[PDB]
Amino acid sequence: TNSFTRGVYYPDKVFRSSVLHSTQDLFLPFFSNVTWFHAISGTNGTKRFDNPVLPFNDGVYFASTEKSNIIRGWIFGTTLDSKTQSLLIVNNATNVVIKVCEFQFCNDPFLDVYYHKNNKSWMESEFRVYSSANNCTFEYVSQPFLMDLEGKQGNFKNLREFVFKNIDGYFKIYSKHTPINLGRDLPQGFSALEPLVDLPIGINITRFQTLLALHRSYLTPGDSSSGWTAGAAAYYVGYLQPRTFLLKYNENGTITDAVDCALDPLSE
Amino acid sequence: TKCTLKSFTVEKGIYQTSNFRVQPTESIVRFPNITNLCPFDEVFNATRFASVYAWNRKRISNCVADYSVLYNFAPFFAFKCYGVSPTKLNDLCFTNVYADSFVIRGNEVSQIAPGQTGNIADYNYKLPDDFTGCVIAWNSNKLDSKVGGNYNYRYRLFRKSNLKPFERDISTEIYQAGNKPCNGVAGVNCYFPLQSYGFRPTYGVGHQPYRVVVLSFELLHAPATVCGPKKSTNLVKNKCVNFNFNGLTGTGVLTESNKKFLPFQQFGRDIADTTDAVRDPQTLEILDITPCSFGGVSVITPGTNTSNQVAVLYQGVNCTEVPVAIHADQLTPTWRVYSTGSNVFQTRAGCLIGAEYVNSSYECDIPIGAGICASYQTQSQSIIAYTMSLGAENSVAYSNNSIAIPTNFTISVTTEILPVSMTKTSVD
Amino acid sequence: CTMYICGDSTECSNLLLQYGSFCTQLKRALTGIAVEQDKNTQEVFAQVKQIYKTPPIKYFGGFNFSQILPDPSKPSKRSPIEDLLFNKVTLLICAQKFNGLTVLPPLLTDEMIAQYTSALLAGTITSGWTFGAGPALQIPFPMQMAYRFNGIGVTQNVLYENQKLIANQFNSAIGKIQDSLSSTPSALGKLQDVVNHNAQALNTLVKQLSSKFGAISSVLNDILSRLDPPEAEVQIDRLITGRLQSLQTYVTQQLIRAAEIRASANLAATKMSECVLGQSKRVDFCGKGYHLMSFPQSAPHGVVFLHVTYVPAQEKNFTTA
Amino acid sequence: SRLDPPEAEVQIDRLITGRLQSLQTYVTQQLIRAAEIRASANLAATKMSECVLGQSKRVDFCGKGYHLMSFPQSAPHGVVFLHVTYVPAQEKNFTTAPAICHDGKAHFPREGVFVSNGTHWFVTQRNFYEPQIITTDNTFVSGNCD
Amino acid sequence: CTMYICGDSTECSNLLLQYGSFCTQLKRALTGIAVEQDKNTQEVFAQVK
Amino acid sequence: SRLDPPEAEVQIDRLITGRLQSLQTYVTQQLIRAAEIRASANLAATKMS
Ligand SMILES: *[C@@H]1O[C@H](CO)[C@@H](O[C@@H]2O[C@H](CO)[C@@H](O)[C@H](O)[C@H]2NC(C)=O)[C@H](O)[C@H]1NC(C)=O
Ligand SMILES: *[C@@H]1O[C@H](CO)[C@@H](O[C@@H]2O[C@H](CO)[C@@H](O)[C@H](O)[C@H]2NC(C)=O)[C@H](O)[C@H]1NC(C)=O
Ligand SMILES: *[C@@H]1O[C@H](CO)[C@@H](O[C@@H]2O[C@H](CO)[C@@H](O)[C@H](O)[C@H]2NC(C)=O)[C@H](O)[C@H]1NC(C)=O
Ligand SMILES: *[C@@H]1O[C@H](CO)[C@@H](O[C@@H]2O[C@H](CO)[C@@H](O)[C@H](O)[C@H]2NC(C)=O)[C@H](O)[C@H]1NC(C)=O
Ligand SMILES: *[C@@H]1O[C@H](CO)[C@@H](O[C@@H]2O[C@H](CO)[C@@H](O)[C@H](O)[C@H]2NC(C)=O)[C@H](O)[C@H]1NC(C)=O
Ligand SMILES: *[C@@H]1O[C@H](CO)[C@@H](O)[C@H](O)[C@H]1NC(C)=O
Ligand SMILES: *[C@@H]1O[C@H](CO)[C@@H](O)[C@H](O)[C@H]1NC(C)=O
Ligand SMILES: *[C@@H]1O[C@H](CO)[C@@H](O)[C@H](O)[C@H]1NC(C)=O
Ligand SMILES: *[C@@H]1O[C@H](CO)[C@@H](O)[C@H](O)[C@H]1NC(C)=O
Ligand SMILES: *[C@@H]1O[C@H](CO)[C@@H](O)[C@H](O)[C@H]1NC(C)=O
Ligand SMILES: *[C@@H]1O[C@H](CO)[C@@H](O)[C@H](O)[C@H]1NC(C)=O
Ligand SMILES: *[C@@H]1O[C@H](CO)[C@@H](O)[C@H](O)[C@H]1NC(C)=O
Ligand SMILES: *[C@@H]1O[C@H](CO)[C@@H](O)[C@H](O)[C@H]1NC(C)=O
Ligand SMILES: *[C@@H]1O[C@H](CO)[C@@H](O)[C@H](O)[C@H]1NC(C)=O
Ligand SMILES: *[C@@H]1O[C@H](CO)[C@@H](O)[C@H](O)[C@H]1NC(C)=O
Ligand SMILES: *[C@@H]1O[C@H](CO)[C@@H](O)[C@H](O)[C@H]1NC(C)=O
């Protein structure tokens, strides 16, 4: 799929209305394609895990669609072990656990009996990824950023969009939830992302992985051919680039539009 | 007028001299209720800080860092802050402070500047060029020392490459000094990168350990955290004050803001460089800071050759409100004897003070603006502000079959003045 | 300068007088431009000592002048053509006043300008060119045109033999002018540019305060509260030079811009005194073709002319000797 | 004399920039001032070559009214013109008509306008009332008078 | 400016943008002169349709 | 390549001001020169007409 217009946020924490201010910050380029990494997560027999490692090329635009709580968290850090601090995030049931403490190996939910989702709709026996370490950086538990709107008779798709970026060590999370019905991946339109979380932790972040709990399989197909295809997707990952984006706000203050300055000569 | 024009005899006409500016009534300082003392004062009470290979970052949380309390404990040695002034560290608000525990050789305590690139910089810690922060230190030789030599001050002597600023890791490797695989332990052509000072308490200050607290901070968009016990004050919504909102020094008329900040948005800006809107640290109120009402002043005079009465023009002000209702010492220009003046005549370029508008039009001499002129004559000589007369009204009886043919003439000789050449100049 | 250069700070203002009279010159230079604009309108319009009124009955020999004569019905006593001109020239504003930037209103109001324009129209229509050489003299319009045809090379018998046809041509031609400005979006390009350049020049001047000019920050109050006094000025004076030079550049740019306007302002006065106040024998000075007579029309920050020209057509070639 | 050479330049160069840029402004201000004079200088030459060296048909170019002559006069840093102009006065209004019909044919004035004092019709020049008896050499015929 | 003032150096160019719009004005001012030269030839010569 | 970064701008900004002011002087000098040409260009247009 192609990131047509999504991947735009509020660059600075300053209000302005009816202004055409320019910005030098990091942004996801317009009209750039992003990877799917569609994972079946069958939880059957021996091993069903299809969440590979991502290079984290100077920040990640992470989009995802689910029903209630398919996505769980993210993992950062290079060594992926207790040797270096891992920026592990857990989207709790009614909380968030954003911890940096080292872990030997993140745990996983039990690969249960072959009778996986016959009638076992209960919710327990989670991953419990937090491996105890004597050396820990303090966590930043706060309000959960996963708010879900109940849509009925279909025609609802609460897409969750996030941007994770590292600049001068400071690590920032921008987030948005958009409850619009999409007929295709990365639907048209415009939605600016608000700044949510800051992090004053400085360490190398050259690797990336996604946490997803799908012990109860809910409409997850698979494929075995790389290329530019179409179909249902669990999430999308794009890499941010140094750009020179220009922004247009509203009278109310919402960022109504943005234009690239290195994509099209007309845009220039 | 005769001061700005620099003479004693001013000619008839209008002259721009200065501006009319009201002055703030009171001073307002507004800070977040929280003022919990800051726990970084406990760092001063501590004895052992760190060994410089995996330096930590003691982030000071949301509290109040009465810096004078730290200055009341013991005298400081370096106190060299190449950033914010380390004297008025009280009435400005810090988003976050990142002082780190540190100690180094007393020959290198004076090398805390980010220019001494070497063992201290390329291997221990490097400070970026575009950096703001302070450096403080005090005596730590007698408190912690060893007769044989302080081996606890071991540090990273050598590493793989240049140590980038704001990077924290342990160089657990052995330097390749020759053709030797350094994955295995060796002593020849493969040396372990490490150095220990071995300090002793019976030598000069050039070889005595000094504990150093590198104060690192930055002024951010984030809400203010650590800016002292200073008294919060009241709030006004109609009067110009000298506000100090979260360390944002400024002045102007503060009023309620109808602009819709997003639930997170904090500072408001116009299409300009000054902060137009602001969010109150307490009661989450949104204010609409605007500069105090002001305008330029020009004086209409008929010349000292003729008289001495003058009429002042406050440009671009609805003067029924601002200059008429001036309290004692409301303006620094003063000359407040004309608070009400002789008569007031509102004009699109601001009202006139000291002149009476007459209903009879004349050809005018001193222009003011918006079709209004001024002159000095009788109503017993005063300054009037009549609307300028466009000329004597006339009408000619156009008709179907009427011609007007002159029967006489007048050979009139007029004059015309034209500059041709200005005086030549040459400089060296 | 006391407002634009320094944020009404007594610390910065002391450094401003430290630079001498770089600001007395700028205030004086801009004052010369301000009095120049009020002077420029004087030569273009204030060419008549008296103000004339058209008679109540307005049968101008079949010529229709309703598009250019003022209509008393409107509260703004302006012609329908002038009304269209005023609507098509679009003149933020409040943010400039808070940084020491001011706009002074012109000495002559737009309503007073339309009175000179009406006076000039009344003199040309009823009195002809005589009201620019002395006392206005009564002369019927059908015979005014006959002595304007005599001024281009056609005998006066041509007009009377085609008076009704010529009036229909003039009435239809003047009615196309109103639609011509509406159709073309760039019709008033020269006038719209004058107000555009001024707005952009002030907008650039306000936006120049963001240039930190080698200092810590663009906000002057930031340094005074954050940076100690005895060393802050080396950043203030670094900031004041860029701020002052940016202000000086704007003043210089206005001087060339005002000089170009003075070239156009004198040209309009030159055209007013010959195309309108008489009949000009110069070719292509008062419109394409043999010029007959002209009409002044008030416009925002300028003037609009309606040159009535004589253009031959429907020709046949003969044998001469 | 007061401050040492190795560090005086950082105060001299600070002083030389303001001193030089002050001189730069004067040089620039002269260029616009000289350009304005050039517009006036060429206008004076244009007026000299038309108002003085001849008679100008341009209205309100060589003085108010019909221009006759001009006299240049030397002046400090400029020139002074004495425009001699013709201005009508003592006007009278008569009854007029565009043409005269005598034998069914229209008669038009070769020069001047037809003027009647109340009883007899006269044709006279435009800028001076000099009535004349309407004869066939003072008019021409173009078609019938209908 | 990016070429005359700075020798295509990313260190100098960062300082140049830090001065604001002294360089958008010069580019615009010279652009206005360039249009004038093409216009000046129009009135002198392009008088016949 | 010779002088260190954290005070190279101390000499770069001193050099950029004189370099920029010279460029600004050329831009201004062209404006008067173009204005004089425009006066001559209109004169040629008048003579042509
Ligand atoms: C800014 O947001 C406000 C609401 O927060 C909008 O105001 C509403 O606009 C709709 C548009 O039709 C009206 O039906 C409502 O009655 C308005 N409500 C209120 C309380 O004003 C406003 O339109 C928005 N501004 C925009 C879109 O420019
Ligand atoms: C002939 O001229 C005389 C004066 O020269 C006219 O008399 C006055 O003209 C002025 C012109 O503005 C009018 O305001 C007065 O009302 C006139 N007074 C009278 C008593 O008429 C006279 O009307 C003119 N007559 C014709 C036929 O042109
Ligand atoms: C001047 O001539 C016109 C027509 O040649 C005379 O008739 C007037 O014509 C206009 C326009 O058609 C009408 O609005 C008027 O009502 C007409 N007047 C009359 C009395 O019918 C006009 O009367 C002549 N002027 C004078 C003073 O007689
Ligand atoms: C035309 O004007 C001239 C002067 O403007 C008149 O000459 C004057 O005539 C009176 C009558 O005796 C003398 O008292 C004056 O001394 C004369 N003036 C001069 C300057 O000599 C002349 O009478 C006028 N003629 C008409 C017909 O109006
Ligand atoms: C002069 O032209 C105007 C055109 O503006 C004429 O006004 C028109 O009059 C007719 C008949 O009353 C209307 O149908 C049109 O709508 C009018 N046009 C408008 C209002 O724009 C005016 O009548 C003409 N003068 C004379 C004497 O006929
Ligand atoms: C994205 O596009 C690049 C170049 O257009 C291509 O090499 C890459 O395979 C694409 N990846 C996906 C997942 O579409
Ligand atoms: C387990 O489920 C996955 C998808 O949910 C499916 O691909 C797999 O075939 C299943 N296991 C078996 C043994 O069928
Ligand atoms: C998640 O929530 C459960 C109960 O809702 C709580 O016991 C647990 O501590 C939470 N985890 C984190 C990391 O906050
Ligand atoms: C388990 O599956 C059976 C299938 O017959 C169903 O009847 C029963 O309701 C299921 N249990 C639950 C708790 O839903
Ligand atoms: C954890 O703490 C102790 C401190 O010596 C030790 O086991 C080890 O060095 C630490 N782990 C790190 C720094 O990764
Ligand atoms: C981060 O990685 C870079 C290169 O991969 C290295 O030069 C640097 O020392 C690393 N920093 C830390 C703190 O490990
Ligand atoms: C701070 O004090 C003000 C005083 O009115 C109060 O309104 C506000 O709620 C307080 N805020 C907190 C966080 O206690
Ligand atoms: C007043 O002006 C006149 C001429 O304008 C002059 O002769 C006289 O000396 C002046 N008086 C004073 C006191 O300057
Ligand atoms: C000026 O002030 C008066 C109060 O006397 C008020 O009625 C009027 O609306 C004000 N006008 C403007 C333009 O501010
Ligand atoms: C002006 O108004 C006053 C009072 O309304 C009146 O007495 C006077 O006659 C008027 N003058 C003129 C010239 O209208
Ligand atoms: C008009 O002039 C003639 C010239 O002979 C004269 O006889 C006649 O009396 C004049 N008319 C009047 C009304 O004086």
Numbering used by the authors:
A (entry chain C): 29 to 296
B (entry chain B): 297 to 675, 687 to 735
C (entry chain C): 736 to 826, 847 to 1076
D (entry chain B): 980 to 1125
E (entry chain A): 736 to 784
F (entry chain A): 980 to 1028
Give me lines lifted from the publication on this model.
Owing to multiple mutations to the spike protein, including in the receptor-binding domain (RBD) and N-terminal domain, Omicron BA.1 infection can result in substantial NAb evasion. We expressed and purified the prefusion-stabilized trimeric ectodomains of BA.1, BA.2, BA.3, BA.2.12.1, BA.2.13 and BA.4/BA.5 spike (S-trimer). We determined the cryo-electron microscopy (cryo-EM) structures of these S-trimers at overall resolutions of 3.1–3.5 Å.
The BA.4/BA.5 spike that we used in our experiments also contains the N658S mutation, which was present in early BA.4/BA.5 sequences but later disappeared owing to the lower transmissibility of this variant, and may correlate with the more closed RBD configurations of the BA.4/BA. By contrast, BA.1, BA.3 and BA.4/BA.5 spike possess relatively tight inter-subunit organization with more buried areas between S2 subunits. Notably, the F486V mutation in BA.4/BA.5 spike decreases hACE2 binding activity owing to reduced hydrophobic interaction. We also noted potential reductions in hydrophilic interactions owing to R493Q reversion. Despite this discrepancy, we conclude that BA.2 subvariants and BA.4/BA.5 are able to maintain high binding affinities for hACE2. However, we found that BA.2 subvariants BA.2.13 and BA.2.12.1 showed increased immune-evasion capability over BA.2—with BA.2.12.1 exhibiting greater evasion than BA.2.13—and BA.4/BA.5 exhibiting even greater evasion. Nevertheless, BA.1-stimulated group B and C NAbs were significantly evaded by BA.4 owing to F486V and L452R RBD mutations, concordant with results from DMS, which explains the strong humoral immune-evasion ability of BA.4/BA. However, group D1 antibodies showed reduced efficacy against L452 substitutions, with L452M (BA.2.13) causing mild escape, L452Q causing moderate escape (BA.2.12.1) and L452R (BA.4/BA.5) causing severe escape. All seven tested Omicron subvariants displayed substantial evasion against neutralization by class 1 and class 2 RBD antibodies: the variants evaded neutralization by REGN-1093323 (casirivimab), LY-CoV01624 (etesevimab), LY-CoV55525 (bamlanivimab), COV2-21965 (tixagevimab) and BRII-19626 (amubarvimab), whereas only BA.4/BA.5 evaded DXP-60415,27, which showed reduced but still competitive efficacy against BA.1 and BA.2 subvariants.
